[PDB]
Design a protein around this ligand. Structure first.
Ligand SMILES: [Mg+2]
Ligand SMILES: [Mg+2]
Length: 386
């Protein structure tokens, strides 16, 4: 659904440059259900592409100097297929710098270039978001009251910044705490954060597969008074288990969506979703990526299914995810982590009242510090072309 009618055939890839940018998230992220402390440090691998004397920037992965050497000289148009879709071989390495480039050259935000029927030209793009940063930051505290207070204060930091919806890590009893104790702590923490967000705040819980079906049912029942919007990764996806869970929720009149799709997903997950076992699909916004998601999102829309791309671990993906919502009707939320990357100015985006306002400026609306990136390319990155 990309508009590529205005791409001249004389337009060629002149130069490809690469650098890793670094920074930090606002608050160090602790453990989750399956692994240890995530930390405070953040990076974003970036490529700067030069086509017809103009540059575009974006996320770039799986690219080597040798790989990029072979792309120099090519016509932009030959990277696309007739259908208007960037070819598979170029997506992970180049889709973002290319889309940004196209927006810069055409003077349009990417969302305008990939817009679908549900967003009419000229209207501001405002997308729902949630605060994804509520990890197991309480583990060093033995006292439940203190643990709840600490997690409430973390949610409040988000609320103070304009967040209204919160995704809370649960599954403490899977690995990090004794089973029963950790499960009681999960419940106390979720109720606690519920009180910060208030009755209109959507609460998501993510167990990172630390539960089984019966632990999940115990937790859902305990939280029947919380405004639980969705349950994510209760346990590794399994059609029989989710069918059972959906029937149990149905009998209770408990309206909680099932979300899944991150990491090494079941190859049949979308099929299970079309049969009604899973409601929200969560493939990563970087890999498989944006071009993949535009196609997938249309398919899911047709099936009446929901999209919520995963973004954790790459600040750039937050902003990409925002633009993707213009192409996907049943887009749910931007997964938001508060991160400062040196040289990557995202002040064009704003969080207000549980939504992220996407700027109407060209490409992805992110302003990279050209001189800093030039320095980093020299210092530790690389360059192909001239
Ligand atoms: Mg998750
Ligand atoms: Mg899963």
């Amino acid at each position: 659904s990309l508009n590529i009618t205005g791409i001249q055939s004389d337009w060629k890839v002149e130069k490809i440059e690469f650098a890793k940018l670094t920074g930090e998230r606002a608050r160090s992220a602790g453990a989750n259900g399956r692994i240890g402390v995530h930390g405070k440090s953040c990076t974003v691998d970036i490529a700067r592409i030069t086509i017809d004397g103009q540059t575009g920037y974006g996320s770039s992965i799986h690219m080597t100097p040798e790989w990029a050497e072979d792309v120099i000289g090519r016509r932009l148009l030959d990277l696309f297929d007739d259908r208007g879709r960037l070819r598979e071989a170029y997506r992970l390495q180049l889709e973002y710098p290319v889309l940004d480039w196209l927006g810069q050259r055409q003077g349009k935000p990417v969302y305008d270039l990939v817009s679908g029927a549900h967003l009419e030209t000229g209207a501001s793009l405002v997308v729902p978001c949630y605060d994804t940063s509520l990890y197991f930051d309480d583990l060093h505290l033995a006292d439940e009251r203190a643990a709840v207070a600490l997690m409430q204060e973390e949610a409040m930091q988000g609320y103070a910044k304009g967040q209204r919806h919160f995704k809370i890590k649960v599954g403490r009893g899977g690995r990090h705490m004794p089973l029963w104790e950790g499960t009681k702590r999960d419940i106390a923490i979720v109720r606690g954060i519920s009180e910060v967000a208030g009755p209109a705040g959507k609460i998501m819980i993510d167990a990172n597969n630390a539960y089984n079906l019966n632990l999940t049912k115990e937790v859902l029942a305990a939280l029947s008074d919380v405004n639980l919007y969705w349950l994510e990764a209760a346990f590794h996806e399994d059609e029989a288990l989710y069918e059972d869970l959906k029937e149990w929720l149905g009998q209770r009149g408990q309206n909680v969506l099932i979300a899944d799709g991150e990491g090494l997903a079941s190859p049949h997950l979308i099929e299970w979703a079309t049969r009604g076992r899973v409601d929200v699909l969560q493939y990563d916004i970087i890999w498989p990526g944006f071009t993949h998601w535009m196609e997938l999102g249309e398919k899911l829309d047709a099936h009446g299914l929901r999209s919520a791309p995963h973004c954790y671990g790459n600040a750039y993906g937050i902003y990409a995810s925002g633009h993707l919502s213009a192409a996907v009707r049943n887009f749910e939320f931007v997964e938001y982590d508060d991160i400062t990357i040196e040289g990557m100015d995202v002040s064009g985006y704003r969080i207000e009242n549980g939504e992220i306002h996407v700027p109407a400026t060209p490409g992805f609306g992110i302003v990279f510090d050209d001189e800093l990136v030039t320095y980093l390319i020299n210092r530790s990155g690389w360059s192909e072309g001239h």
